[PDB]
Structure 1
Amino acid sequence: MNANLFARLFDKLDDPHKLAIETAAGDKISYAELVARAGRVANVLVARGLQVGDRVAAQTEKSVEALVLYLATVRAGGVYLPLNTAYTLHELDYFITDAEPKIVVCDPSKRDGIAAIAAKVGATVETLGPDGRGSLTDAAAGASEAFATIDRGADDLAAILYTSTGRSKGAMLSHDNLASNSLTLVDYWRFTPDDVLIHALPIYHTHGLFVASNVTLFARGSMIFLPKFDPDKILDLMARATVLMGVPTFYTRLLQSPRLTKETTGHMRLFISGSAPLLADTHREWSAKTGHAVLERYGMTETNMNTSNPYDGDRVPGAVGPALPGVSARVTDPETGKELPRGDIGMIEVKGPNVFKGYWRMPEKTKSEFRDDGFFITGDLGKIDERGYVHILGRGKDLVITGGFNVYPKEIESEIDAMPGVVESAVIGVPHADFGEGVTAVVVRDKGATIDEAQVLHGLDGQLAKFKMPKKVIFVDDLPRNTMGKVQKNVLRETYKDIYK
């Protein structure tokens, strides 16, 4: 039947009156109520000139109404284009010009400001504020709820999400890209209609917009729709929720709370982290304080989710799990494009029903990033181990070259980080008359941890090829980090420039 994501989500409901969404104010919206809301908004969009295939660009603060706009856009056969709330009027000009949306929805504060930009591409402007009120909401109230969901095929567009070295690119995502991936995750992450997801992520990125929302809705579960992340509120809610999706900072911040215990997390079923790697130390602490594991998973705008750690059993250090059902992952020589033996490091490529359709109005870039056999070149370097787990090892800028051989610091860092007493390691290359660069590990230990330099080197023995062995292990109270909290390896290289003199 209809491949329209809205139809896949809402066509057959056994229990339409069950909770879909609890708002931050505590309002309850059933599945039936959510569908009706979407019907009213879809009627407004069509009334304002939205035709099948047109884009709706939306720069909205997070609200249930903003989520409804996404659903309504796809229902009406439109292509939903969320835009980071951080974009200035000048920055919006780029996206609106590139995408040529028919409708632009923005905060009431920008209404008159975006008028000229919108007029340039022939778009109509509506508004939606952080409270979910605005011209869109005014109009929807007076619109009919009945709407015939537009027929769409698997490969028809549902959304465009822009990426973050060149200009920002519009990733074209199909109905089946979105439906296939979240349906796969419902099963892989063992969701049921009894699940309650704490939703504290932005909805202008893949994670909060698609993964959290679509997985919950395909599962027939519900979400508690928070406007933003707040450690105390989340702790509050865990007593009556089952799932949390977050990013590492969620977990590290939560860990800083005396409130975090086995009891306060006793009701929870599943914790997931994405976007950036969790430290092994954080995995360990979370497990020690709460009794729970935290699942990690590899994904990106162009591919949705590619892998996930298994629901049951072993996390592998440095890895984010095997390819999900339906998804193919491989590692290739970055230049020649030939697949490498398992365990060798190269370019990660993925193929599957999750992979996007290309970049909007950028045919040459689209051509260059796909192999002849349909695999998408991710830009990420890494390896796939003999167990099939994917290890992401960065994007190549941090390369160390020792005795003429390439070394990827993350490969070594994950092994050291997995050792008891280790908070975090940073592997760098500094001048070494014999090897050009000497592999060097700089390690933060737990207060009073007993692990020493010899123990780290012994632990690495056998785990990695000999040429990758650090020549020295240096212990420090902390790592230098930039204002964004990223470890500064240039600073480390300056500090330790003379260690092999």
Structure 2
Amino acid sequence: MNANLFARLFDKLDDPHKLAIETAAGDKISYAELVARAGRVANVLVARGLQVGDRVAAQTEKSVEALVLYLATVRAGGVYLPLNTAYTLHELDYFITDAEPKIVVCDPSKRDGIAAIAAKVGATVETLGPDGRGSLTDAAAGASEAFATIDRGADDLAAILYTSGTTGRSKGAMLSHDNLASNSLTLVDYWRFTPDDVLIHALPIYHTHGLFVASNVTLFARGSMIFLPKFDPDKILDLMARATVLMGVPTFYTRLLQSPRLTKETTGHMRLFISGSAPLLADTHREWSAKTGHAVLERYGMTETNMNTSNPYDGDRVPGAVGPALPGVSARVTDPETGKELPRGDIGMIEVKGPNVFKGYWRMPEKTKSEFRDDGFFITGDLGKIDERGYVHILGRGKDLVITGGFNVYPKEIESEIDAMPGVVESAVIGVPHADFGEGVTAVVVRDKGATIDEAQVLHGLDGQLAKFKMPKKVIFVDDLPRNTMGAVQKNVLRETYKDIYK
């Protein structure tokens, strides 16, 4: 009855020699082998000063060794803290100072620089490279495989993941053993994962999607995964003939749609395509079904909440919607201010509650308090509505709402109109200060190479479909939209870039 995620996963292992992970080089690792690797690394953590509750901060390229470090940290009663591989030394200083890890694991090439930061909190530094080699690996080579998995309670911490930083400086979400186990166990059943599943895993593992959703679901299900270092369209297509599931972000799908190899035949062996982490556009959903005959299953989650909602595996998968609340999870829509729940169909603030919901922000009890309602619901900061069937629809982030001339203007329906115009790839509608209207609705648009469509053409096209107060005051064409490492459009960046256009 140990609640320790590692114990939930592996204490009882009925089929130990079954495949768990195939590496990018084609090496194969069984469940028993994975467990033994984690035992060695857990012993290394203790030998390097880990005490129960200590954080282990890890910035490494993706590898099975890096995944093992996650498992071992949890197993040893530590708190795993993955960090975006792109963070610079200076950025890392903030996270290391905030979290005060006892151990920091980094790429061999950064050891000297990171050691300086680590010394500020007295952390021990080990290394792990893209090839799975380094001081961590040397230490594990002589360590014992046997390790008594540490007793942990449901609410004890297993991890701290920093948010993606879309709306400001990343905050450290404190995730418990039960947060992670309850969510992944629910998903195994809800998505019907079985030991026969083979998951193509091409996502980063410093983010909740690639780290927890991909790994924990597979591992609980006793299925396996195939690692790829990053999104590679041709390698992903190659693997579909011998895999059953792909978890991706919308950019995976729009990029795969550009391959002439993406056909019914090429995807015919696959069971399920899942999309998450950013909005899957309804047009993208329809394009995928038109080209491949598969209905993409989209789900919605956050760093702070793990997965909240999902389109059903055995029900209607609705373009533009993220599905009803998962089993065990409650979702509602409230008046953003007052907090009163709204009638089904009304747009407002999405709030969630459940065993998936985190314990708060690391050493930010005040900001934690402001993000929870009195009755324990968490304010997502996402605006949307819940339809008559209980499907949640996300309209945008609260900060993406544009208030202009006294009106609430929701950008997505404008973007949908612009996207539908011939010559348009995609568009982002934002608001920036305007002296006459409060904010000026501004359309930032990516067009096809050689497309003729221009500003006047775009505004005229909208004129006959859109209320006057919703009309963009100008259209700005760009080579591409700014996106973070997980493929999300950064409207924060756009608002900053164009803040002065109406000055």
Length-normalised TM-score, structure 1: 0.86
Name the CA shift for 1:471/1:91 in 2 (closer, same or farther; >3 Å): closer
Per-residue deviation, residues 378-409 of structure 1 (Å, max 9, x unmatched): 11111111211111111244445577442313
Number of aligned residue pairs: give it: 501
Unaligned 5+ segments in structure 2 are none
Which residue of structure 2 lines up, in the alignment, with residue 444 of structure 1? Answer: 446
Contact residue 318 and residue 414 of structure 1 kept, 8 A: no
2:469 is paired with a residue whose SS is helix
Considering only aligned residues, what root-mean-square deviation do their CA atoms show, in Å? 4.6
Contact residue 317 and residue 414 of structure 1 kept, 8 A: no
Per-residue deviation, residues 332-359 of structure 1 (Å, max 9, x unmatched): 1111111111111111111100000001
Name the CA shift for 1:15/1:126 in 2 (closer, same or farther; >3 Å): same
Distance in 2 of aligned mates of 1:470 and 1:326: 42
Distance in 2 of aligned mates of 1:206 and 1:483: 13
Per-residue deviation, residues 204-238 of structure 1 (Å, max 9, x unmatched): 00000000001100110000011111111111111
Distance in 2 of aligned mates of 1:40 and 1:118: 23
1:12 is paired with a residue whose SS is coil
Contact residue 281 and residue 422 of structure 1 kept, 8 A: no
Name the CA shift for 1:123/1:464 in 2 (closer, same or farther; >3 Å): same
Per-residue deviation, residues 62-97 of structure 1 (Å, max 9, x unmatched): 000000000000000000000111111111111111
Name the CA shift for 1:75/1:191 in 2 (closer, same or farther; >3 Å): same
Distance in 2 of aligned mates of 1:201 and 1:248: 12
1:240 is paired with a residue whose SS is coil
**Displacement after TM superposition at 1:360 (Å):** 0.6
Distance in 2 of aligned mates of 1:350 and 1:104: 33
2:452 is paired with a residue whose SS is coil
Q: Does residue 419 of structure 2 align to residue 435 of structure 1?
A: no
The worse-fitting range, judged by mean Cα deviation, of 107-116 and 441-450 is 441-450
1:296 is paired with a residue whose SS is strand
Contact residue 4 and residue 177 of structure 2 kept, 8 A: yes
Per-residue deviation, residues 382-440 of structure 1 (Å, max 9, x unmatched): 11112111111112444455774423132565589799999767678999999999999
Which residue of structure 2 lines up, in the alignment, with residue 292 of structure 1? Answer: 294
Per-residue deviation, residues 306-363 of structure 1 (Å, max 9, x unmatched): 0011113323343211111111111111111111111111111111000000011111
**Displacement after TM superposition at 1:168 (Å):** 2.5
Contact residue 245 and residue 271 of structure 1 kept, 8 A: yes
Name the CA shift for 1:420/1:272 in 2 (closer, same or farther; >3 Å): farther
The worse-fitting range, judged by mean Cα deviation, of 402-411 and 16-25 is 402-411
Runs of 4+ more than 3 Å apart: 164-167, 396-405, 411-501
The worse-fitting range, judged by mean Cα deviation, of 371-380 and 312-321 is 312-321
Contact residue 61 and residue 130 of structure 1 kept, 8 A: yes
Per-residue deviation, residues 265-312 of structure 1 (Å, max 9, x unmatched): 111000011122122222122112211111111111000110011113
The worse-fitting range, judged by mean Cα deviation, of 396-405 and 227-236 is 396-405
The worse-fitting range, judged by mean Cα deviation, of 327-336 and 275-284 is 275-284
Distance in 2 of aligned mates of 1:500 and 1:122: 50
Distance in 2 of aligned mates of 1:182 and 1:103: 27
1:264 is paired with a residue whose SS is helix
Unaligned 5+ segments in structure 1 are none
**Displacement after TM superposition at 1:123 (Å):** 1.0
Distance in 2 of aligned mates of 1:34 and 1:484: 27
Per-residue deviation, residues 175-207 of structure 1 (Å, max 9, x unmatched): 000000011111111101000000000100000
Name the CA shift for 1:138/1:383 in 2 (closer, same or farther; >3 Å): same
Contact residue 252 and residue 282 of structure 1 kept, 8 A: yes
Contact residue 19 and residue 30 of structure 1 kept, 8 A: yes
Distance in 1 of aligned mates of 2:13 and 2:364: 39
Name the CA shift for 1:258/1:103 in 2 (closer, same or farther; >3 Å): same
Equivalent runs, 1:254-273 vs 2, <5 Å: 254-273=256-275
1:412 is paired with a residue whose SS is helix
Contact residue 39 and residue 144 of structure 1 kept, 8 A: yes
Name the CA shift for 1:180/1:421 in 2 (closer, same or farther; >3 Å): farther
The worse-fitting range, judged by mean Cα deviation, of 395-404 and 38-47 is 395-404
Name the CA shift for 1:29/1:402 in 2 (closer, same or farther; >3 Å): same
Contact residue 127 and residue 134 of structure 1 kept, 8 A: yes
* Percent identical residues: 100
Contact residue 330 and residue 350 of structure 1 kept, 8 A: yes
Name the CA shift for 1:438/1:171 in 2 (closer, same or farther; >3 Å): closer
Per-residue deviation, residues 131-168 of structure 1 (Å, max 9, x unmatched): 00011111111011000000101100000011235543
Name the CA shift for 1:433/1:194 in 2 (closer, same or farther; >3 Å): same
1:397 is paired with a residue whose SS is helix
The worse-fitting range, judged by mean Cα deviation, of 293-302 and 163-172 is 163-172
The worse-fitting range, judged by mean Cα deviation, of 462-471 and 311-320 is 462-471
2:332 is paired with a residue whose SS is strand
**Displacement after TM superposition at 1:263 (Å):** 0.8
Distance in 2 of aligned mates of 1:442 and 1:457: 12
Name the CA shift for 1:258/1:335 in 2 (closer, same or farther; >3 Å): same
Distance in 2 of aligned mates of 1:442 and 1:129: 39
1:297 is paired with a residue whose SS is strand
Distance in 1 of aligned mates of 2:272 and 2:197: 10
Name the CA shift for 1:251/1:98 in 2 (closer, same or farther; >3 Å): same
Name the CA shift for 1:36/1:342 in 2 (closer, same or farther; >3 Å): same
Contact residue 429 and residue 438 of structure 1 kept, 8 A: yes
1:93 is paired with a residue whose SS is helix
Distance in 2 of aligned mates of 1:206 and 1:244: 16
Distance in 2 of aligned mates of 1:484 and 1:144: 37
Distance in 2 of aligned mates of 1:420 and 1:293: 25
Name the CA shift for 1:151/1:248 in 2 (closer, same or farther; >3 Å): same
Distance in 2 of aligned mates of 1:476 and 1:128: 39
Distance in 2 of aligned mates of 1:177 and 1:480: 32
The worse-fitting range, judged by mean Cα deviation, of 486-495 and 307-316 is 486-495
Name the CA shift for 1:375/1:419 in 2 (closer, same or farther; >3 Å): farther
The worse-fitting range, judged by mean Cα deviation, of 199-208 and 81-90 is 81-90
The worse-fitting range, judged by mean Cα deviation, of 18-27 and 310-319 is 310-319
Distance in 2 of aligned mates of 1:202 and 1:441: 31
The worse-fitting range, judged by mean Cα deviation, of 459-468 and 289-298 is 459-468
Name the CA shift for 1:456/1:70 in 2 (closer, same or farther; >3 Å): same
Name the CA shift for 1:490/1:367 in 2 (closer, same or farther; >3 Å): closer
Name the CA shift for 1:463/1:358 in 2 (closer, same or farther; >3 Å): farther
Distance in 2 of aligned mates of 1:241 and 1:11: 27
Q: Does residue 388 of structure 2 align to residue 386 of structure 1?
A: yes
Name the CA shift for 1:484/1:23 in 2 (closer, same or farther; >3 Å): closer
Name the CA shift for 1:338/1:457 in 2 (closer, same or farther; >3 Å): farther
